[PDB]
Amino acid sequence: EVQLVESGGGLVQPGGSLRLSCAASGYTFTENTVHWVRQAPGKGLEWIGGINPYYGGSIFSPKFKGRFTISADTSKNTAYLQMNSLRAEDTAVYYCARRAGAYYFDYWGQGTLVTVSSASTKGPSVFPLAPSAALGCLVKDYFPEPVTVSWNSGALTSGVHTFPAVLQSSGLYSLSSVVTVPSSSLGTQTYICNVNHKPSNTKVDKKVEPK
Amino acid sequence: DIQMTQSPSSLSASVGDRVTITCRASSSVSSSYLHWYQQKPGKAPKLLIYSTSNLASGVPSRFSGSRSGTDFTLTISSLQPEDFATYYCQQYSGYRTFGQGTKVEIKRTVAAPSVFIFPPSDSQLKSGTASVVCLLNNFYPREAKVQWKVDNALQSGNSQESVTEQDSKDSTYSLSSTLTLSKADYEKHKVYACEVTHQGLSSPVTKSFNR
């Protein structure tokens, strides 16, 4: 089973550098090229470049030749994207992707966010949204994106609406995650919202009961 | 360099409808080297069709592609609600580029939102801010007016909205509206209300609480 797992995203100050990695598994590494493709928020897909680990060579789109380099470590079945002199325009979700056949990308990594901003990392506070059936939790004042929310450690998934983060006038983000439940189960089952903010190494678990 | 001009940038169609998306190559692109991707919100792009007309593994037969000279077409013969996504063509010709994308939205019958309102939690006032959350759940169409009224005075400039992506099963949207005050100002008012206007409601729906 072929899989590409990315890591190394995060926050970088304008002019800074960052290194992304793409760990490939489930196939003979040297048999396929690995490419990088990015997506600025709310925009389209943009090809950056890719490496061929059999020949050990890489190629780039003309807009990125210069600033970025791509390497591969065959022993670890990992490709790397080394970025330098990043600007706010480089803020995007970065995907890696495997080429197969007639130059199509058949397997993609999961994406990792790279935010270029002089701002500093802040963890979120988590407040309950009390039923009285709709309940949920508010995830306030964090930077940068993203935050992940689950309910009852993944057990509760249906009826869940986790809203896109909003940027507040303070420059921090906020979102709510909400879930509809049966009008009469408020006594018996317990509902906890699980919040994850990796840029700040924060993990909070919040219990939501009626007041 | 070869560029792909994709149109339309968005469309809305009903379940069962036939949908056609066009990518026009700025000069000749080989049939072998034009591919289509489907990207669902929050997900990596997925290979949909490769080399103009070949269905990727596990793609349903309602998807097809063809070529006519420099013009490539992606067709969905019978739109399913889970086909909500952005579709991208991609060419290879030395370098790679993508079309700008087509966002396919589902048209469905009107659905009134369920309106809920949430007061700030105790834990949040202890921090010196009060967030009041108005939740509109599972509605169609997307356009909805949310008005905040504090002691029946109409608010302005102190709230912000977030809306979810169209649900892949029932095609409804969900919306959150958050009113932010300092705790100090929350305590100098009694009645907090949000009034919802939507096509599916005969009369505006107000949801409220007294502090």
XYZ file of N, CA, C and O in Angstrom, chain B residues 55-126:
288
model
N -10.049 6.164 -16.751
C -10.505 6.334 -15.378
C -9.446 5.821 -14.419
O -8.942 4.704 -14.577
N -9.088 6.646 -13.441
C -8.179 6.190 -12.402
C -8.830 5.054 -11.613
O -10.037 4.811 -11.707
N -8.011 4.344 -10.845
C -8.502 3.180 -10.116
C -9.629 3.574 -9.174
O -9.492 4.502 -8.377
N -10.760 2.883 -9.291
C -11.863 3.095 -8.378
C -12.679 4.340 -8.619
O -13.402 4.768 -7.716
N -12.588 4.944 -9.797
C -13.400 6.116 -10.094
C -14.668 5.640 -10.794
O -14.585 4.822 -11.722
N -15.851 6.107 -10.386
C -17.098 5.631 -11.006
C -17.219 6.018 -12.471
O -16.685 7.033 -12.928
N -17.995 5.217 -13.198
C -18.100 5.357 -14.641
C -18.827 6.617 -15.074
O -18.783 6.946 -16.259
N -19.507 7.326 -14.174
C -20.150 8.571 -14.594
C -19.145 9.667 -14.968
O -19.538 10.663 -15.582
N -17.875 9.525 -14.596
C -16.826 10.443 -15.038
C -16.242 9.979 -16.371
O -15.978 8.788 -16.560
N -16.053 10.918 -17.299
C -15.319 10.630 -18.527
C -14.596 11.887 -19.012
O -14.941 13.011 -18.633
N -13.592 11.683 -19.873
C -12.941 12.786 -20.555
C -12.710 12.475 -22.025
O -12.667 11.317 -22.442
N -12.568 13.544 -22.807
C -12.272 13.462 -24.226
C -11.416 14.657 -24.628
O -11.241 15.611 -23.867
N -10.910 14.611 -25.855
C -10.137 15.704 -26.425
C -10.655 16.038 -27.821
O -11.058 15.150 -28.581
N -10.656 17.329 -28.147
C -10.956 17.806 -29.495
C -9.918 18.891 -29.781
O -10.025 20.002 -29.256
N -8.906 18.555 -30.584
C -7.789 19.463 -30.835
C -7.129 19.914 -29.533
O -6.657 19.108 -28.729
N -7.071 21.223 -29.319
C -6.505 21.801 -28.113
C -7.507 21.889 -26.951
O -7.142 22.375 -25.878
N -8.748 21.421 -27.121
C -9.797 21.549 -26.101
C -10.064 20.204 -25.436
O -10.431 19.238 -26.109
N -9.934 20.154 -24.114
C -10.185 18.946 -23.348
C -11.441 19.131 -22.504
O -11.678 20.214 -21.957
N -12.233 18.067 -22.382
C -13.495 18.130 -21.651
C -13.532 17.056 -20.572
O -13.177 15.902 -20.825
N -13.952 17.438 -19.367
C -14.296 16.485 -18.318
C -15.809 16.473 -18.174
O -16.435 17.533 -18.083
N -16.407 15.290 -18.229
C -17.854 15.168 -18.136
C -18.211 14.297 -16.933
O -17.597 13.242 -16.720
N -19.157 14.777 -16.125
C -19.848 13.985 -15.111
C -21.254 13.753 -15.642
O -22.017 14.711 -15.825
N -21.606 12.501 -15.924
C -22.873 12.291 -16.626
C -24.078 12.440 -15.703
O -25.122 12.952 -16.140
N -23.950 12.033 -14.433
C -25.057 12.066 -13.476
C -24.508 12.549 -12.134
O -23.968 11.756 -11.360
N -24.654 13.843 -11.863
C -24.054 14.446 -10.679
C -24.610 13.810 -9.418
O -25.827 13.768 -9.225
N -23.692 13.284 -8.543
C -23.965 12.807 -7.194
C -23.559 13.858 -6.163
O -22.637 14.651 -6.404
N -24.228 13.912 -5.002
C -23.903 14.975 -4.040
C -22.476 14.902 -3.533
O -21.902 15.939 -3.178
N -21.872 13.720 -3.513
C -20.470 13.602 -3.141
C -19.512 14.056 -4.250
O -18.292 13.999 -4.061
N -20.010 14.502 -5.393
C -19.118 15.028 -6.415
C -18.762 16.487 -6.181
O -17.992 17.061 -6.960
N -19.293 17.085 -5.119
C -18.914 18.433 -4.736
C -17.408 18.477 -4.500
O -16.882 17.734 -3.671
N -16.713 19.311 -5.274
C -15.253 19.390 -5.232
C -14.802 20.477 -6.196
O -15.600 21.054 -6.943
N -13.504 20.742 -6.176
C -12.863 21.548 -7.203
C -12.103 20.602 -8.121
O -11.391 19.711 -7.641
N -12.287 20.773 -9.431
C -11.683 19.907 -10.437
C -10.593 20.678 -11.168
O -10.802 21.838 -11.546
N -9.437 20.039 -11.368
C -8.278 20.679 -11.996
C -7.765 19.812 -13.126
O -7.555 18.612 -12.936
N -7.536 20.412 -14.283
C -6.727 19.716 -15.267
C -5.248 20.024 -15.048
O -4.871 21.023 -14.422
N -4.407 19.143 -15.583
C -2.960 19.229 -15.453
C -2.356 18.693 -16.745
O -2.724 17.602 -17.195
N -1.459 19.467 -17.355
C -0.724 19.031 -18.536
C 0.729 18.783 -18.187
O 1.271 19.374 -17.253
N 1.358 17.916 -18.970
C 2.804 17.758 -18.966
C 3.349 18.074 -20.354
O 2.783 17.641 -21.362
N 4.428 18.813 -20.419
C 5.045 19.182 -21.667
C 6.471 19.637 -21.442
O 6.988 20.422 -22.151
N 7.096 19.091 -20.435
C 8.421 19.480 -20.060
C 8.266 19.978 -18.649
O 8.847 19.452 -17.783
N 7.445 20.991 -18.457
C 7.096 21.524 -17.172
C 5.669 21.046 -16.965
O 5.116 20.374 -17.797
N 5.087 21.419 -15.851
C 3.712 21.079 -15.524
C 2.986 22.354 -15.173
O 3.559 23.232 -14.525
N 1.734 22.465 -15.608
C 0.843 23.479 -15.063
C -0.527 22.854 -14.888
O -0.839 21.824 -15.492
N -1.340 23.498 -14.050
C -2.722 23.133 -13.785
C -3.664 24.190 -14.355
O -3.312 25.368 -14.452
N -4.868 23.775 -14.736
C -5.925 24.744 -14.928
C -6.268 25.422 -13.616
O -5.904 24.956 -12.542
N -6.978 26.546 -13.697
C -7.273 27.312 -12.489
C -8.340 26.659 -11.614
O -8.536 27.111 -10.482
N -9.022 25.630 -12.100
C -9.954 24.888 -11.271
C -11.407 25.241 -11.547
O -11.746 26.372 -11.918
N -12.287 24.257 -11.350
C -13.734 24.451 -11.421
C -14.367 23.934 -10.138
O -14.258 22.744 -9.821
N -15.048 24.813 -9.417
C -15.751 24.413 -8.204
C -17.166 23.962 -8.568
O -17.971 24.749 -9.073
N -17.456 22.697 -8.329
C -18.764 22.128 -8.610
C -19.549 22.104 -7.306
O -19.127 21.473 -6.328
N -20.667 22.827 -7.285
C -21.595 22.877 -6.165
C -22.896 22.183 -6.544
O -23.282 22.157 -7.720
N -23.591 21.650 -5.538
C -24.843 20.932 -5.758
C -26.015 21.844 -5.443
O -26.085 22.442 -4.359
N -26.934 21.947 -6.396
C -28.248 22.542 -6.179
C -29.188 21.496 -5.583
O -29.213 20.354 -6.049
N -29.949 21.882 -4.550
C -30.876 20.980 -3.870
C -32.073 21.800 -3.396
O -32.125 23.017 -3.595
N -33.059 21.131 -2.790
C -34.261 21.846 -2.373
C -33.946 22.752 -1.189
O -32.977 22.536 -0.453
N -34.802 23.762 -0.998
C -34.624 24.687 0.116
C -34.705 23.935 1.437
O -35.478 22.981 1.598
N -33.869 24.340 2.384
C -33.909 23.790 3.727
C -33.713 24.939 4.699
O -32.726 25.672 4.598
N -34.664 25.108 5.608
C -34.550 26.123 6.644
C -33.469 25.734 7.651
O -33.302 24.553 7.967
N -32.707 26.697 8.151
C -31.740 26.402 9.206
C -32.414 26.220 10.554
O -33.433 26.842 10.855
N -31.816 25.353 11.364
C -32.080 25.309 12.795
C -31.217 26.371 13.471
O -29.992 26.388 13.288
N -31.842 27.262 14.234
C -31.139 28.376 14.857
C -30.919 28.076 16.335
O -31.859 27.726 17.059
N -29.666 28.198 16.775
C -29.280 28.069 18.168
C -28.394 29.249 18.556
O -27.668 29.808 17.723
N -28.477 29.636 19.834
C -27.680 30.721 20.394
C -27.009 30.207 21.657
O -27.583 29.387 22.383
N -25.775 30.648 21.888
C -24.972 30.197 23.015
C -24.437 31.404 23.771
O -23.805 32.293 23.167
N -24.638 31.473 25.081
C -24.021 32.535 25.876
C -22.557 32.235 26.144
O -22.151 31.061 26.147
N -21.739 33.263 26.394
C -20.355 33.017 26.834
C -20.301 32.133 28.068
O -21.184 32.170 28.926
N -19.250 31.323 28.142
C -19.055 30.428 29.272
C -18.499 31.187 30.479
O -17.979 32.303 30.368
N -18.603 30.563 31.654
C -17.997 31.175 32.831
C -16.493 31.296 32.644
O -15.914 32.368 32.852
N -15.858 30.212 32.181
C -14.410 30.192 31.991
C -13.934 31.323 31.087
O -12.802 31.798 31.229
N -14.778 31.778 30.161
C -14.319 32.795 29.222
C -14.418 34.188 29.818
O -13.539 35.027 29.588
N -15.488 34.463 30.562
C -15.595 35.759 31.217
C -14.478 35.946 32.230
O -13.911 37.037 32.337
N -14.117 34.876 32.948
C -12.958 34.928 33.836
C -11.720 35.444 33.116
O -10.834 36.030 33.746
